[PDB]
């Protein structure tokens, strides 16, 4: 019983699409069927900023961040709960929600 319009994910006219190792189980899952998360995270996490900028030499230096594009197997982002179990009328959405604030984990 077909569950998704696109089946797994997004393979339109390519025939077959390259794999990618999942970030934390190293499972060969393809590129388009991969829960891609893309973190830009600070290097001190928001509480050592008031401690590093004491022992800064310069005029606050402002500190760099991380840059990595994490891929996930579908189990290894249901277990990590990046992505869960939308309803049947909400499996059809891609565009909402954040709806509250700027999103955290950057921050």
């Amino acid at each position: 019983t077909k569950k998704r319009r696109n089946g797994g994910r997004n393979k339109h006219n390519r025939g077959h699409v390259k794999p990618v190792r999942c970030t934390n189980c190293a499972r060969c899952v393809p590129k388009d069927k991969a829960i891609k998360k893309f973190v830009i995270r600070n290097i001190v996490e928001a509480a050592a900023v008031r401690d590093i900028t004491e022992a800064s030499i310069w005029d606050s230096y402002v500190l760099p961040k991380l840059y990595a594009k994490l891929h996930y197997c579908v189990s290894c982002a249901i277990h990590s709960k990046v992505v869960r179990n939308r309803s049947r009328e909400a499996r059809r959405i891609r565009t909402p929600p954040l709806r509250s604030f700027p999103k955290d984990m950057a921050r």
Binding site: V44, I52, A55, I57, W58, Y61
Partner: peptide, 9 residues
């Protein structure tokens, strides 16, 4: 008291 600046990765 190690007054530092360069924070690279």
């Amino acid at each position: 008291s190690m007054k530092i600046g360069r924070i690279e990765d």
